[PDB]
Paper text:
Three B77 or F145 scFv molecules bind to the FMDV-OTi capsid around an icosahedral threefold axis. The structures show that B77 contains an intermediate length HCDR3 loop with 18 amino acids, but F145 and R50 contain ultralong HCDR3 loops (50 and 61 amino acids, respectively). The ultralong HCDR3s form an elongated “stalk” and a globular “knob” at the distal ends of the stalks, and the stalk region is essentially a display scaffold to deliver the knob domain, which functions as an effector domain that mediates the molecular recognition of antigen. The globular knob of F145 interacts with VP2, but the globular knob of R50 binds to a shallow depression on the capsid, contacting the two major capsid proteins VP1 and VP3 from two adjacent protomers. F145 interacts with the VP2 BC-loop (OTi-VP2T71 and OTi-VP2S72) and the HI-loop (OTi-VP2V189, OTi-VP2N190, OTi-VP2T191). The side chains of OTi-VP2S72 and OTi-VP2T191 form hydrogen bond contacts with the side chain atoms of F145-VHS119 and F145-VHT128. The amide nitrogen of OTi-VP2N190 provides additional stabilization via hydrogen bonds with the hydroxyl group of F145-VHD129. A Ser→Ala mutation was found at position 72 in VP2, which is also located in the virus-antibody binding interface. The VNT results showed that FMDV-OTi with the OTi-VP2N190S mutation exhibited a 2.9-fold reduction in VN titer, and the OTi-VP2S72D mutation resulted in a significant reduction (~30-fold) in VN titer. Structure comparisons of FMDV-integrin and FMDV-NAbs show obvious clashes between NAbs (B77 and F145) and the integrin receptor, suggesting that FMDV neutralization by B77 and F145 is facilitated by blocking virus-receptor interaction via steric hindrance.
[name] (FMDV), a small nonenveloped single-stranded positive-sense RNA virus (genus Aphthovirus within the family Picornaviridae), is the causative agent of [name] (FMD). As the major antigen, the virus capsid of FMDV comprises 60 copies each of four virus-encoded proteins, VP1, VP2, VP3 and VP4; VP1 to VP3 form most of the capsid shell, with VP4 lining the interior surface. In the current study, we isolated a NAb (R50) that neutralizes FMDV serotypes O and A. We determined the cryo-EM structures of FMDV serotype O (O/Tibet/99) in complex with B77 and F145 scFv, as well as R50 scFv in complex with FMDV serotype O (O/Tibet/99) and with serotype A (A/WH/CHA/09). The final resolution of the cryo-EM reconstruction was estimated by the FSC 0.143 cutoff to be 3.90 Å for the FMDV-OTi-B77 complex, 3.68 Å for the FMDV-OTi-F145 complex, 3.94 Å for the FMDV-OTi-R50 complex and 3.49 Å for the FMDV-AWH-R50 complex.
Numbering used by the authors:
A (entry chain 2): 13 to 218
B (entry chain 3): 1 to 219
C (entry chain H): 1 to 137
D (entry chain 1): 2 to 132, 157 to 208
E (entry chain L): 5 to 112
F (entry chain 4): 15 to 39, 66 to 85
Write the structure that this text describes.
């Protein structure tokens, strides 16, 4: 079950992927809208992976210890600059958390891409499942690969004021390194925009 | 048996905007012939769209006297229809009573002066989210145009409408620190012997400007 | 043989303030804490303030909210504050060295297992089940 | 069954072992048909801003509406009020509730039932917004009256676009013993 | 605070002991030190390492510890030893120092 | 469509009764319908 994704020029290869999990849609639609006068352009040299170290899944991590990332997260390079120069930006995400285990570690780690995470009380975690999600228990695999479209109350969005997606990685069953586990399993995230768009170029600063 | 109706409850109150029509009290009136009168406009977004009107400025006048010594910015104002610069135009006058405008706003800058003035201006629409520019070289990265003034006087820059919401409000006034719709800046990049000669700016509606949701505050 | 001294008057008038001093000199005068001692006659001694080379001090909530202690460098002095004095506090004041330490230790049947991270650090030996002990201190 | 651990919508049917699963009927859950009920909202004295979030978090509507990140409703408010009742569209400034040129139903013995359109300048409103208090722009207007004592929203033509967790009351002793009606 | 007998006495040339009864939190798990304290002048450290004696300290002052109990044995007491004796210790429940009662030695 | 059962062509025109809709240019039902049912391994007896 090899799954060699690619976005732009930055592939990712994983030899244990359980499969891609499209959340809420198979393909984003209708970028060209009336709330811009057609002045939108589609940036294409900015759809590339970028790693973000998430957290240290350490064995003493009870149920429901979740680490929320606000997407889009602070970025640098070709992207990060697009946000720095465009009043309105729009993009659907592709998120690939690659926690790596020694296939002797037991826990059921649940990765979800929730829209507009504001507050989840300790109980809401039990139903957090109804969200584009994938479990990454080390025994069956390591790689969770969610892809989501752009959800929002607007065609386009202002990234400084609003972050639409919260990447939530909740520890469902704590890590038991019973005989030969990794002592502490780190968790990274290959996150990558898709179907980027921009509008309304900001003035210079210099 | 009489037809039963069971007149329901909570209905039939006088609603000032209801679609119902009143009950006739007088009949057979035959008003005199109103046909083929000279000037008839069906909806006010024809007057606003085909007849431009002036814009108020820092100095009370419609024009903007060219700056001379070092500063190239002539006018810079928020795009909301409540702006002091646009408060006197028929467009804002009509947009008091509506809530959400959508489409476009044209700005007709006609340069009035001596033939040898030969000035060169620039208008740029700085979207919201960053302090608006204060120098043409810093504003050039925006949706901006430039135009000489040789023979034709009027130049109509169609200010775009790009925003997240498919409709933006017509009222500037609330607790806001910064403009929501974005500044519009008008720079005079360079000028010849036209120093002291006015630029008469006008406003209008666009080929797709639309308002909706009528509401009357005490104007 | 550190030659220490507590300085001040033998008595303090109630409704008025008292201050003290603590000299310490010698080769070893700076390698350990400079604490204070008083004696309640017929009762347990009240643990007063302390200090270390960097102004680091250890107090008990018994009299902490009424002791304030500063250090003087040139003569190696340290001062005590008895705030809201009383006739019962009349007693023989002293400045001493004091010792306090805490060893995070491990469980009886588990090894330190330093490589394993997090709160759970100790690990089984014969069973070989690692990272299962939240080691007591 | 014994499938894999990805997000696969595999629901084990009764047919796996001996048996038969048939005729599932799902009327009474269709988002259009459960949402269309009048929900009571604690009104303000004289001026309240219609926003379907003002509903409580434990009514059949106020809790089946917060299970949807984006909702498109069209609301049919029904008010009980002492004087003329003026409804200004959203982003209709204050001091526009006093002018009777806005939809202003006169006093009636029964509660006045208006049928307000959905005026917000947005594709779909939201229930949570990543910015405790949603933006000022998610409304349907405001009801200005001398006194308001009962205010019930109704969501006509509802369509909700994302799910989100509901939470039932958490009991003890493994059973939430209620007192069901019984003669 | 620890418990010591606040009245102890001894004659010239005899060996006097100063006792201190502690608990599992301060003596049974932590160190204990002893000192000799004259009025108007601060002590000199006397007994550390739970059995050892610092340089300069005459070996006539010796220490010991067993369980929650600690002692200060002063062999051959002389007129200069007429002073106050105090105990030190480290406790965990208070997360900070806890001390004895203090013993005035009256040389008869 | 939902919780309206009066079988009579509504009196007020559609534009005045509801907010008309405009188009441009149903996923959870698809998800639940495309749900792996039955079994995953050879079945016996």
């Amino acid at each position: 079950r090899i799954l060699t994704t690619r976005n732009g020029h930055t592939t990712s290869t994983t030899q244990s992927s359980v499969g891609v999990t499209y959340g809420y849609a198979t393909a984003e639609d209708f970028v060209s809208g009336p709330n811009t006068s057609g002045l939108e352009t589609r940036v294409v040299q900015a759809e590339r992976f970028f790693k973000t170290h998430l957290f240290d899944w350490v064995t003493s991590d009870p149920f429901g210890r979740c680490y929320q990332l606000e997407l889009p997260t602070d970025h640098k390079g070709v992207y990060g600059s697009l946000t720095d120069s465009y009043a309105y930006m729009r993009n659907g995400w592709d998120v690939e958390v690659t926690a790596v285990g020694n296939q002797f570690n037991g826990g059921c780690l649940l990765v979800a891409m929730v829209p507009e995470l504001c507050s989840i009380d300790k109980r809401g975690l039990y139903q957090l499942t109804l969200f584009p999600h994938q479990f990454i228990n080390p025994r069956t695999n390591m790689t969770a690969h969610i892809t989501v479209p752009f959800v929002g109350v607007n065609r386009y969005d202002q990234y400084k004021v609003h972050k639409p997606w919260t990447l939530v990685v909740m520890v469902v069953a704590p890590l038991t390194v019973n005989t030969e586990g990794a002592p502490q399993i780190k968790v990274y995230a290959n996150i990558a925009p898709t179907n980027v768009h921009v509008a309304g170029e900001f003035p210079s600063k210099e | 048996g009489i037809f039963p109706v069971a007149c329901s409850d909570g209905y039939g109150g006088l609603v000032t905007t209801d679609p119902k029509t009143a009950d006739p009290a007088y009949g057979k009136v035959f008003n005199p012939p109103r046909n083929m009168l000279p000037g008839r406009f069906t909806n006010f977004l024809d007057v606003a769209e085909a007849c431009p009107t002036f814009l108020h400025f820092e100095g009370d006048v419609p024009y903007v006297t060219t700056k001379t010594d070092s500063d190239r910015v002539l006018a810079q104002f928020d795009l909301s229809l409540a702006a002091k610069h646009m408060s006197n135009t028929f467009l804002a006058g009509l947009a008091q009573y509506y809530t959400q405008y959508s489409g476009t706003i044209n700005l007709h800058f006609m340069f009035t002066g001596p033939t040898d003035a030969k000035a060169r201006y620039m208008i740029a629409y700085a979207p919201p989210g960053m302090e608006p520019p204060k120098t043409p070289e810093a504003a050039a990265h925006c949706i901006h145009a430039e135009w000489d003034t040789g023979l034709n006087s009027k130049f109509t820059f169609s200010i775009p409408y790009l925003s997240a919401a498919d409709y933006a409000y017509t009222a500037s006034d609330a607790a806001e620190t910064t403009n929501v719709q974005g500044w519009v800046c008008l720079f005079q990049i360079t000028h010849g012997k036209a120093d002291g000669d006015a630029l008469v700016v006008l406003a209008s509606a666009g080929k797709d400007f639309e308002l909706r949701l009528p509401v009357d505050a005490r104007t | 043989q550190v030659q220490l001294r507590e300085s001040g008057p033998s008595l303090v008038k109630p409704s008025q303030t008292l201050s003290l001093t603590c000299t310490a000199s010698g080769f070893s005068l700076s390698d350990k804490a400079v604490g204070w001692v008083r004696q309640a006659p017929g009762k347990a001694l009240e643990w007063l303030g302390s200090i270390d080379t960097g102004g680091s001090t250890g107090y008990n909530p018994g009299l902490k909210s009424r002791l304030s202690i500063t250090k003087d460098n040139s003569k190696s002095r340290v001062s005590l504050s008895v705030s809201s004095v009383t006739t019962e506090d009349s007693a023989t004041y002293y400045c001493t060295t004091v010792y306090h330490e805490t060893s995070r230790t491990c469980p009886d049947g588990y090894i330190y297992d330093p490589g394993c991270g997090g709160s759970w650090v100790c690990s089984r030996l014969f069973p070989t089940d690692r990272c299962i002990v939240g080691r007591t201190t | 069954t014994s499938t894999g651990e990805s997000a696969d919508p595999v629901t084990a049917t009764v047919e796996n072992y001996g048996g038969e699963t048939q005729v599932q009927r799902r009327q009474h859950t269709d988002v259009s048909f459960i949402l269309d009920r009048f929900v009571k909202v604690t009104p303000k004295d004289q001026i309240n801003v219609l926003d379907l979030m003002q509903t409580p978090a434990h009514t059949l509507v106020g809790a089946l509406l917060r299970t949807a990140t984006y909702y498109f409703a069209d609301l049919e408010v029904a008010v009980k009020h002492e004087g003329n009742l003026t409804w200004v569209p959203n982003g209709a400034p204050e001091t526009a509730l006093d002018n009777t040129t806005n939809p202003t139903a006169y006093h009636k013995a029964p509660l006045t039932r208006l049928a307000l359109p959905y005026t917000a300048p947005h594709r779909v409103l939201a229930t949570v917004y990543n910015g405790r208090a949603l933006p000022t722009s998610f409304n349907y207007g405001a009801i200005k009256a001398t006194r308001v004592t009962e205010l019930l929203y109704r969501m006509k033509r509802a369509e909700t676009y994302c799910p989100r967790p509901l939470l039932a009351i958490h009991p003890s002793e493994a059973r939430h013993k209620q007192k069901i009606v019984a003669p | 605070v620890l418990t010591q007998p606040s009245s102890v006495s001894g004659s010239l040339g005899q060996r006097v002991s100063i006792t201190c009864s502690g608990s599992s939190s301060n003596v049974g798990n932590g160190y204990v030190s002893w000192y000799q304290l004259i009025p108007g002048s601060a002590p000199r450290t006397l007994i550390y390492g739970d059995t050892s004696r610092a340089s300069g300290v005459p070996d006539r002052i010796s220490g010991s510890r067993s369980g929650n109990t600690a002692t200060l044995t002063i062999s051959s007491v002389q007129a200069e030893d007429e002073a106050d004796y105090f105990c030190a210790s480290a406790e965990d429940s208070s997360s900070n120092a806890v001390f004895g009662s203090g013993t005035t030695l009256t040389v008869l | 469509s939902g919780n309206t059962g009066s079988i009579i062509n509504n009196y007020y025109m559609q534009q005045y009764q509801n907010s008309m809709d405009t188009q441009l240019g149903d996923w959870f039902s698809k998800l639940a319908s495309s749900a792996f049912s039955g079994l995953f391994g050879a079945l016996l007896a």
